[PDB]
A paper describes a structure:
The transient receptor potential channel TRPM7 is a master regulator of the organismal balance of divalent cations that plays an essential role in embryonic development, immune responses, cell mobility, proliferation, and differentiation. The TRPM7 structure represents a tetramer assembled of four identical subunits, with the overall architecture reminiscent of other TRPM channels.
In contrast, the gain-of-function TRPM7-N1098Q mutant showed increased single-channel activity, characterized by the higher value of Po = 0.63 ± 0.30 (n = 3; 11,449 events). Nonetheless, these structures were substantially different, as evidenced by the high value of the root-mean-square deviation (r.m.s.d. = 1.53 Å for Cα atoms) for their overall superposition. While the S1–S4 and coiled-coil domains in this superposition appear to overlap perfectly, the clear difference between the two structures originates in the pore domain, emphasized by shifts in the positions of TRP helices, and is further propagated to the N-terminal domains, which move as rigid bodies away from the axis of the overall 4-fold rotational symmetry. Our ~2 μs-long equilibrium MD simulations confirmed that the pore of TRPM7-N1098Q is permeable to water and cations while neither water nor ions permeate through the TRPM7Closed pore, which is sealed at the gate region by the side chains of I1093 and N1097. Upon channel opening, the S6 helices became two α-helical turns longer, while TRP helices became two α-helical turns shorter and rotated by ~6° in the plane of the membrane. Here, all structural changes in TRPM7-N1098Q are confined to the pore region, with the cytosolic domains left unaffected.
Residue numbers in the entry:
A (entry chain A): 3 to 540, 614 to 797, 839 to 1147, 1157 to 1230
B (entry chain D): 839 to 1006
C (entry chain D): 1099 to 1147, 1157 to 1189
D (entry chain B): 1190 to 1230
């Protein structure tokens, strides 16, 4: 039946008839009134049962004999006469009301339903997730009433306490009592608002009026919400979400749940509270207006299986408030003022008519309650003690169970209540044995609760002695808490795509993940030789810089709020932020690449750009203090980060606001010059000094002091250590600015010669010009091979895919390959000697050169793209050409729309021919450029140049061409121009940042090239080869300076953090909504005082009364 | 996932029916371009028959998607379909083709010169103008792409609303 | 015109995908020269003798549950921001 | 002097002396009422 409720759980049927209150009366013949009102000790009529076996008494007489000795009549028991016979009330209520529906669920069941299946109904069947708190509400069972202040404050606190701990409120489920007032408070407070306070009412079935409506299988239970006061029995309060209804087998009887309700709570405080945490779910109990049984059940908690605290509030009603009285006037041991029982027994007889000897018993038991007042909690709502019932509720479960302060934190940690922990658990004079703090931190980190981590870090914890290898290895490999599906995929690939089905994660295999995420030739400290051994082998396992290893964790597991927090702590702030940007950015790519079950990449994209801006804002700060030191920060080896550099890391992430920041730019300019002081020299003096070397010794060079911030080579460092002449030439020819204008001049002289060769005739053998051309291209090629093999990546297949990912490197490959095809044909041809251009192998060779040369003119746009003013226009041209594809397809369609009808009308006797392919494109294309072929349009006109193709239909071709040019020349060309106009505006908006970012790869290229240009470069290769066969820039800082840099780090690391808060406090509209927050305490307190001012003035005249 | 079910999954996907009609339509224009550019003898060539077959069945295809439309009133199945630019153009392109075929085919061939019989010429010249309809129908295939379609929308709005500048 | 269309071009393209895609959900699987066989077979079928989301009741039920849950969460939200 | 948002942040400056002094008076109003019953004690 797929209805586990129907199957395992069951109802109760009165299957026997025992006349109750059988008092024969009106309407003289017996049977009629013996058939009118003969109730049973079950509670129903014999005619209201009928029950397929109780109908057998409607017809004859009550299911028994006649008189049927009254020694035997009394003997009902649901144990004896009641058959179970599955439930018929497992529907769902649709409580009608406000602009919503207050939907809720229910079930019928017996008072002896097992405590485990009722759990297997709440959690398994109803999907309801196990709580971290229960609020067992035990107050008034009649329609009690309260005043406005308590109506709001008590409401918020009870609600909020359930919000924080995801609690399960428990009531009777009946809107005569607590449930009415419990449920109400949820209504106004908007607890529903993107939120649920799980709320349950254990009621009995028989009473709830319109129970017969709820009868039936799974249905939208049309509970009618009639507030008709004729139905005393009850109206189910329409806010409680769930209604377990004890079908004990009685109707009109009461108290079917009193044990079950408790047993459910007993087997709610008997399961774990999030397995990382080991504790039973704590259970508070509250008291509203309340009766003499409501105080009685307080004695069923204080002296009960694991002691259940009590949160009697102050000011509610008769019970909840009176228990404050006996609390207040009586000592910690419940020591009464001896005239208490001589004047409280008036209070009982004042509040109740419970009696006198009865009342004596009440206070006596009520002190038997108050024998232990370390465990109850009077919420003094007047005088504002705990300032919401909440803080008293939660505190009440952290005091009176002889629990340890670790056992007190660990619960607060589970609840998301730091405020409870900092204010109560972290109280003056506390014990905290040895690793309690440490065990909480392994719990707080895996559970992703920064606010407790933050607190613990302030309250004695140190990450230095707490990051051991088993521990942090644990902290990686936990699916408890916010879990990443991506890391398990990342470990898959690096582990050959082979998982042991269990596969505990090591620190080692993670190191290969980072080396894949950071890319290039990064080497994590988890894959090194020393670490890899001591790991297997395993005091020394305390990780010299732990806050570096946790920042990796928080980012590999998408725990941003932990990452961003931990980043604040420790040192190497700017570096950690540029790694994080790289880690997230790569995972944000591998999501979009792997494209599996995984998702959530734009979330990672945002996380990278979050840390990216942090590194930029630290650069700003550090640069506004000392420009020179900031440059040194961009270039010191890190040594915890694979001996990399903060700049190098930011280029890997393509983090442009950092590379386009004026600090890097001023440094990029200083590496461009080398030891040349170009603020004093000029680029025309560099060109002159290349062509006239003696001017090299006339230029203004630099010292060591104004070169100390610049990353230098081993040589450029050393040659300055030990300003003579030979060192003045070494400074010039090794500067990147010189290697540019020395390759540029050779390249321009290359094109001048190569232009001369294609324009001047070729005899059999090459001329000196053509040999010098071939020499350039040959060595230029070797130069390009080297800068692939000597790239930065390590995998040759990735050294390759990056280099071929640039336009001008692809073009050079084609230009170099196409040249030697041409040389091979030009040179390997058998010369004719009657005419050069009769041998078609020689011609093909020459014609490849004359097209080859176009590649080499266009390579000059790459030299021009170096200039700040020209480069934006080279970017445009590429974006224009790349993205105009679809306009040009339309243009080619419009073209054939015209070219095919024209050729068909004008040339109607054409066999198939290759000319037909030319003649449908040729003239229509030159029209695009405004050539209308004026004397060819009308071919039958007297001034025609085509008088012979006059014939039938040819008069159609002017009309065709008139339409064509309007569409082509006016619409389509200016649509393309309109596109290009928007490209222009887009590029100019971004052109300067992109130019600044591309200076890096540019300048670093001309820091690695040889000092000789491509014809003479071969000597530099030779010398730089037989060196290696026989046998880059680093900021060299002495320890005295290396020290002060770290001092300049921390000082600027510091001043940044302080600043952000200070500006952020001020705000603009923040301040206005901080005002509005303050508009309440005024209005409340202008009503506080304004409430008393009427209380003041009544006094004054009463004192003069 | 057996074999016959793997073919049923492919040829019944909309992406396949697009790139299968698109390739036939492009092969249609390649042939129909070949027919107008190459001379016509008395009877059609295999190329021209394959052209006529396309256009004939292409028409029946358009009849069906009117009668098998979503509306119920035939007079509203009609006014909606003719409310699209390329369905109006196809109607003209289909009607104008068979006027041309009827003249091209129903003409009395001359045998001294094809282009002396003016009924044959009118037929050929309708085809050579008819073909413009079929190049322009390709803008509807291109309008499927996110990048090209905005430029087809422009051209229509440009042409529709430039009336008064062109009168001046 | 250019600037006007580009401001609205992406919404209109997205709206026109519907009639486009639904067209090529109803067409025959054979293209217009060979389509005649598809007409013939799809005619003598009718002479002799569209897309629906088929949900089993177990799933059809949970959809209505996904309705109301999201129907609910919407109404609560609007007020709270407002 | 007049300003536009200046005035709003001159208000916010004044939101404190009110809140302090609404707590000044509001501190005493509890000190007042305890008196009255203590004078009638
Ligand atoms: C990752 C790297 C990035 C950078 C890219 C770098 C890679 C660049 C890659 C470049 C590849 C270039 C390929 C050239 C192929 C030539 C084909 C050809 O047409 O041959 C012709 C000559 O063939 C001969 O062998 C005779 C000519 C002398 C050799 C000159 C070509 C080799 C130079 C190579 C220098 C390599 C340069 C690179 C050096 C490093 C064949 O025709 P024929 O014999 O004339 O015809 C005879 C007919 N007849 C008898 C009727 C007359
Ligand atoms: C605005 C200025 C225009 C005035 C407006 C009024 C329209 C005036 C039009 C009037 C139509 C009558 C003129 C043609 C009569 C035959 C004469 C002739 O020699 O024709 C020649 C061609 O042309 C033709 O054979 C037909 C041309 C029709 C074009 C008109 C289209 C509608 C114009 C808009 C309608 C207007 C209203 C709507 C506007 C919104 C014959 O051939 P051929 O080219 O010499 O050469 C071929 C070979 N041959 C030499 C061996 C023969
Ligand atoms: C809601 C719908 C949306 C979709 C739109 C769909 C609707 C599309 C509607 C299309 C309507 C097309 C109308 C064609 C009229 C031809 C007129 C003509 O010029 O005839 C000529 C031939 O006439 C003949 O009868 C002989 C040629 C054979 C018949 C070919 C045309 C019929 C094909 C129809 C296929 C219909 C296709 C549609 C099928 C579904 C008359 O001239 P002649 O005899 O050559 O001259 C003799 C002179 N001489 C003796 C001196 C030489
Ligand atoms: C690779 C590009 C780099 C930039 C440009 C480099 C070169 C710039 C330098 C000069 C450009 C011009 C070259 C000389 C042309 C000589 C002309 C000739 O054929 O014979 C002549 C003399 O010839 C000699 O005296 C032979 C010279 C030996 C080779 C010199 C190589 C030096 C450059 C090695 C490279 C390293 C240096 C650069 C390092 C940065 C006589 O003249 P002609 O014949 O009556 O006149 C020619 C006209 N004709 C064709 C119609 C007949
Ligand atoms: C002797 C003379 C005889 C020989 C003459 C030979 C003729 C000359 C032949 C060719 C021109 C010479 C240069 C090659 C073209 C540039 C490649 C390119 O775009 O690279 C770039 C992208 O790369 C890609 O996107 C890869 C796929 C290519 C894209 C499609 C266009 C090019 C294909 C061929 C179409 C034309 C057919 C030509 C091919 C047969 C890498 O550069 P980037 O800086 O990263 O910018 C890219 C940015 N983007 C990816 C976002 C867009
Ligand atoms: C990637 C590498 C690609 C290319 C590799 C190498 C390919 C090797 C290619 C060619 C080598 C073949 C040598 C000759 C073969 C026999 C023919 C012969 O000798 O003569 C014939 C030559 O006929 C021709 O067509 C010559 C031109 C062919 C080359 C076309 C360009 C290819 C490169 C494209 C650029 C690629 C750029 C790619 C860049 C990435 C005729 O000449 P004849 O004998 O004087 O005439 C006799 C007849 N007569 C009596 C009427 C006069
Ligand atoms: C034989 C004729 C050859 C000359 C051509 C004459 C025509 C006019 C030519 C060129 C004007 C540009 C030259 C002066 C630029 C100096 C400043 C500059 O822009 O610096 C840039 C570098 O320099 C470049 O990027 C310039 C590129 C040089 C190659 C030119 C090839 C194209 C011209 C070939 C002819 C093709 C057209 C057809 C005409 C025949 C920026 O670098 P930087 O490190 O920032 O610079 C210093 C630091 N600072 C600027 C920050 C302070
Ligand atoms: C002899 C004849 C005369 C010679 C002409 C003169 C030589 C030609 C002149 C200029 C050549 C192009 C300059 C490149 C500038 C750099 C661009 C670049 O780096 O990336 C661009 C791609 O790059 C491309 O798309 C390359 C262009 C394709 C090949 C050019 C064909 C030219 C003819 C075709 C026209 C004919 C069609 C109709 C003809 C019937 C970037 O594009 P993006 O993706 O939008 O941006 C990403 C940014 N990124 C750079 C960071 C990656
Ligand atoms: C409807 C459009 C759809 C797309 C394209 C479809 C067709 C693409 C297929 C091919 C394109 C070319 C067509 C054949 C041309 C033959 C040439 C000829 O006249 O005789 C020849 C052989 O001819 C035969 O053997 C007759 C073939 C019978 C008809 C075949 C129909 C198949 C397509 C049915 C449709 C369903 C398939 C597609 C389903 C998606 C010999 O050649 P020739 O005569 O020496 O040279 C001709 C040039 N001339 C005129 C100058 C002489
Ligand atoms: C073999 C060759 C020989 C024969 C050659 C024959 C020549 C070729 C003849 C014509 C071109 C072929 C296609 C027809 C034109 C498109 C119609 C149209 O605009 O439809 C659209 C509107 O429809 C209307 O608005 C209805 C009234 C027409 C508006 C005025 C312009 C067209 C009139 C005729 C003027 C030209 C005179 C030509 C007519 C005699 C429906 O499409 P839509 O997607 O809803 O877009 C509309 C949006 N709008 C309404 C807001 C704007
Ligand atoms: C909606 C339906 C519209 C059309 C329906 C069908 C209309 C039926 C139309 C024509 C059928 C008429 C058949 C021939 C009649 C007698 C004349 C004759 O035989 O020869 C004459 C033909 O003279 C011409 O002008 C022929 C061309 C007329 C058609 C013009 C296009 C109409 C369609 C527009 C497109 C519509 C697109 C609309 C799409 C929505 C002369 O030729 P000859 O005999 O060789 O010469 C003898 C003289 N000689 C000795 C000097 C050589
Ligand atoms: C052989 C000759 C060469 C062939 C040329 C190439 C073929 C021709 C090329 C392009 C053709 C048009 C592309 C249509 C694109 C779709 C547009 C569309 O759907 O609706 C548009 C209407 O549509 C029109 O107005 C249609 C254009 C009128 C007919 C074209 C005449 C061309 C010549 C005239 C010039 C000559 C004048 C002067 C001459 C002396 C929408 O317009 P809207 O109301 O603003 O927008 C509503 C939006 N809606 C779509 C949702 C409804």
């Amino acid at each position: 039946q797929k209805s586990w409720i129907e199957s395992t759980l069951t109802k109760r049927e009165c299957v026997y008839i025992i006349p109750s209150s059988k008092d024969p009366h009106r309407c003289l013949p017996g049977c009629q009134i013996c058939q009118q009102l003969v109730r049973c000790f079950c509670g129903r009529l014999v005619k209201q049962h009928a029950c397929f076996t109780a109908s057998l008494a409607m017809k004859y007489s009550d299911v028994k004999l006649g008189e049927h000795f009254n020694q035997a009549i009394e003997e009902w028991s649901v144990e004896k006469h009641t058959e179970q016979s599955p439930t018929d009330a497992y529907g769902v209520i649709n409580f009608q009301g406000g602009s919503h529906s207050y939907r809720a669920k229910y079930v019928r069941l017996s008072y002896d339903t097992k405590p485990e299946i009722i759990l297997q109904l709440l959690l398994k069947e109803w999907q309801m997730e196990l709580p971290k708190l229960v609020i067992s509400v035990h107050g008034g069972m009649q329609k009690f009433e309260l005043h406005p202040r308590i109506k709001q404050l008590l409401g918020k606190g009870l609600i909020k306490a359930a919000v924080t701990t995801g609690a399960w409120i428990l009531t009777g489920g009946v809107n005569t009592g607590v449930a009415k007032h419990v449920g109400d408070a949820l209504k106004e407070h908007a607890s529903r608002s993107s939120r649920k306070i799980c709320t349950i009412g254990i009621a009995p079935w028989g009473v709830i009026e319109n129970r017969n409506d709820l009868v039936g299988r799974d249905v939208v239970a049309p509970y009618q919400t009639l507030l008709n006061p004729l139905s005393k029995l009850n109206v189910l309060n329409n806010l409680h979400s769930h209604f377990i209804l004890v079908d004990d087998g009685t109707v009109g009887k009461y108290g079917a749940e009193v044990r079950l309700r408790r047993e459910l709570e007993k087997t709610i405080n008997q399961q774990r509270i999030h397995a990382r945490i080991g504790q039973g779910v704590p259970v508070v109990a509250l008291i509203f207006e309340g009766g003499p049984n409501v105080i009685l059940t307080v004695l069923e908690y204080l002296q009960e299986s694991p002691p259940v605290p009590v949160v009697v509030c102050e000011g509610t009603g008769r019970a909840a408030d009176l228990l404050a009285y006996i609390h207040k006037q009586t000592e910690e041991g419940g020591n009464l003022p001896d005239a208490a029982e001589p004047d409280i027994i008036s209070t009982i007889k004042k509040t109740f008519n419970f009696g006198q000897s009865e009342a004596v018993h009440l206070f006596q038991t009520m002190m038997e309650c108050m024998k232990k007042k370390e465990l109850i909690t009077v919420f003094h709502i007047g005088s504002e003690d705990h300032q919401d019932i909440d803080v008293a509720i939660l505190t009440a479960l952290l005091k009176g169970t002889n629990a340890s302060a670790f056992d007190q934190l660990i619960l607060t940690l589970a609840w998301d209540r730091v405020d409870i922990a900092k204010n109560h658990v972290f109280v003056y004079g506390q014990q905290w044995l040895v690793g309690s703090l440490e065990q909480a931190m392994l719990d707080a980190l895996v559970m992703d609760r920064v606010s407790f981590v933050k607190l613990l870090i302030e309250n004695g914890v140190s990450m230095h002695k707490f990051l051991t290898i088993p521990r942090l290895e644990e902290l990686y490999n936990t699916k408890q808490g916010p879990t990443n599906p991506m890391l398990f995929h990342l470990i898959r690939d690096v582990k050959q795509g082979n998982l042991p089905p269990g596969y505990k994660i090591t620190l080692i295999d993670i190191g290969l993940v980072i080396e894949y995420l950071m890319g290039g030739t990064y080497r994590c400290t988890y894959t090194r030789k020393r670490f890899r051994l001591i790991y297997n082998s395993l005091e020394t396992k305390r990780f010299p810089y732990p806050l570096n290893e946790l920042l990796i964790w928080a980012c590999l597991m998408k725990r941003q709020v932990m990452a961003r927090f931990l980043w604040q702590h420790g040192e190497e702030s700017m570096a950690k932020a540029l790694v994080a940007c790289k880690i997230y950015r790569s995972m944000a790519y591998e999501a979009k690449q792997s494209d599996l079950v995984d998702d959530t990449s734009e979330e990672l994209k945002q996380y990278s750009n979050d840390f990216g801006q942090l590194a930029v804002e630290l650069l700003e700060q550090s640069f506004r203090q000392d420009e020179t030191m900031a440059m040194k920060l961009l270039t010191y080896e890190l040594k915890n980060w694979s001996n990399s550099t903060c700049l190098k890391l930011a280029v890997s992430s393509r983090l442009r606001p950092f590379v386009a920041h004026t600090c890097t730019q001023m440094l990029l300019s200083d590496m461009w010059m080398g030891r040349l002081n170009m603020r004093k020299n000029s680029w025309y003096k560099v060109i002159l000094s290349i062509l006239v070397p003696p001017a090299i010794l006339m230029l203004e060079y630099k010292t060591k002091a104004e070169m100390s911030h610049i990353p230098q080579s081993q040589d450029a460092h050393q040659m300055t250590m030990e300003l003579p002449i030979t060192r003045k030439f070494y400074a010039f020819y090794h500067a990147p600015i010189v290697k540019f204008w020395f390759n540029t001049l050779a390249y321009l002289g290359f094109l001048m010669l190569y232009t001369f060769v294609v324009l001047v005739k070729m005899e059999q053998l090459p001329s000196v010009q053509e040999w010098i051309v071939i020499a350039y291209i040959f060595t230029y090629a070797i130069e390009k091979v080297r800068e692939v093999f000597m790239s930065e990546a390590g995998k040759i297949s990735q050294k390759i895919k990056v280099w071929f990912s640039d336009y001008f490197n692809v073009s050079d490959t084609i230009a170099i390959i196409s040249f030697f095809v041409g040389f091979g044909l030009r040179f390997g041809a058998k010369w004719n000697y009657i005419n050069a251009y009769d041998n078609h192998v020689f011609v093909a060779g020459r014609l490849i050169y004359c097209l080859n040369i176009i590649f080499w003119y266009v390579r000059l746009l790459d030299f021009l793209a170096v200039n700040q003013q020209a480069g934006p226009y080279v970017m445009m041209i590429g974006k224009m050409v790349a993205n105009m594809f679809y306009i040009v397809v339309i243009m080619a369609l419009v073209l054939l729309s015209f070219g095919v009808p024209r050729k068909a009308i004008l040339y109607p006797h054409e066999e198939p021919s290759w000319s037909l392919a030319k003649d449908i494109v040729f003239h229509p294309y030159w029209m695009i450029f405004g050539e209308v072929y004026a004397y060819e349009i009308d071919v039958c006109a007297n001034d025609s140049t085509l008088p012979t193709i006059c014939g039938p239909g040819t008069w159609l071709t002017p009309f065709l061409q008139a339409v064509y040019l309007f569409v082509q020349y006016i619409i389509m060309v200016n649509l393309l121009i309109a596109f290009f106009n928007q490209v222009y505006l887009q590029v100019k908006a971004i052109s300067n940042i992109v130019w600044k970012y591309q200076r890096y790869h540019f300048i670093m290229a001309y820091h690695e090239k040889p000092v000789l240009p491509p014809p003479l470069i071969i000597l530099s290769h030779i010398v730089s080869l037989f060196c290696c066969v026989c046998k880059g820039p680093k900021l060299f800082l002495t320890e005295e300076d290396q020290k002060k840099l770290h001092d300049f780090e921390e000082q600027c690391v510091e001043m940044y953090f302080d600043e952000k808060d200070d500006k952020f406090n001020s705000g603009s509209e923040e301040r206005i909504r901080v005002t509005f927050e303050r508009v309440e305490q005024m209005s409340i307190q202008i009503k506080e005082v304004g409430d008393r001012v009427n209380y003041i003035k009544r006094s004054l005249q009463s004192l003069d009364s």
